[PDB]
Design a protein around this ligand. Structure first.
Ligand SMILES: CC(C)[C@H](Nc1ncnc2[nH]c(-c3ccc4cncn4c3)cc12)c1ccc2c(c1)S(=O)(=O)CCC2
Length: 168
């Protein structure tokens, strides 16, 4: 029902909250939840692991069937699959993993996938163990996405740093 609450409004279409994306998906039941995926859709850890565990592995089984028939995605690409019990759809988006030497310029392409959906619940792409500068990821989101994006960032110090940096 896209009933988001407790978000700071950064711009006319970008919102942010200190929260676990899985708990937000359970509360809101959004039309679209974004997964911070990798090209073979192996949802073992981080955000992807948390979303998969909350579907009791249904997301991993569906992703394996997709990969068997279609092969891996490309960095900057995306795939709409079922949202299972968390949302109507899950938009699996592959941002660059700069810790594994992938090109940071593809982060704009990764965020461009969001523009196909009027409203989305999403994590901060390529942050955490993917190694992108999270302040830069927030700026790319703000400059690229025109649809309504509700960012859930599950770390108080990072959330505070992002808000302070944006408001400078
Ligand atoms: C910067 C981080 C604070 C942020 N983390 C998160 N942001 C939003 N919701 C989250 N839930 C959990 C979580 C993790 C275990 C777990 C176990 N039971 C419940 N859980 C929930 C983590 C998480 C973040 C954002 C983007 C990326 C990553 C991490 S990554 O390291 O997975 C690589 C892909 C890109």
């Amino acid at each position: 029902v896209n009933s988001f609450s407790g978000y700071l409004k950064l711009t006319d279409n970008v919102y942010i909250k200190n929260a676990d994306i899985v708990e937000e998906a359970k509360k809101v039941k959004p039309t679209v939840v974004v997964n911070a995926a990798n090209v073979y859709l192996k949802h073992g850890g981080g955000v992807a692991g948390a979303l998969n565990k909350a579907t009791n592995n249904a997301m991993q089984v569906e992703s394996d069937d997709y990969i068997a028939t279609n092969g891996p995605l490309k960095v900057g690409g995306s795939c709409v699959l079922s949202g299972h019990n968390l949302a109507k759809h899950c938009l699996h988006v592959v941002g660059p993993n700069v810790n594994k030497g992938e090109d940071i310029q593809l982060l704009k392409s990764a965020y461009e996938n969001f523009n196909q959906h009027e409203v989305l619940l999403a994590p901060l792409l390529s942050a955490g163990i993917f190694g992108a500068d999270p302040i830069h990821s927030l700026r790319v989101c703000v400059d690229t996405v025109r649809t309504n994006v509700y960012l859930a960032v599950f770390d108080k110090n990072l959330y505070d740093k992002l808000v302070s940096s944006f408001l400078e």
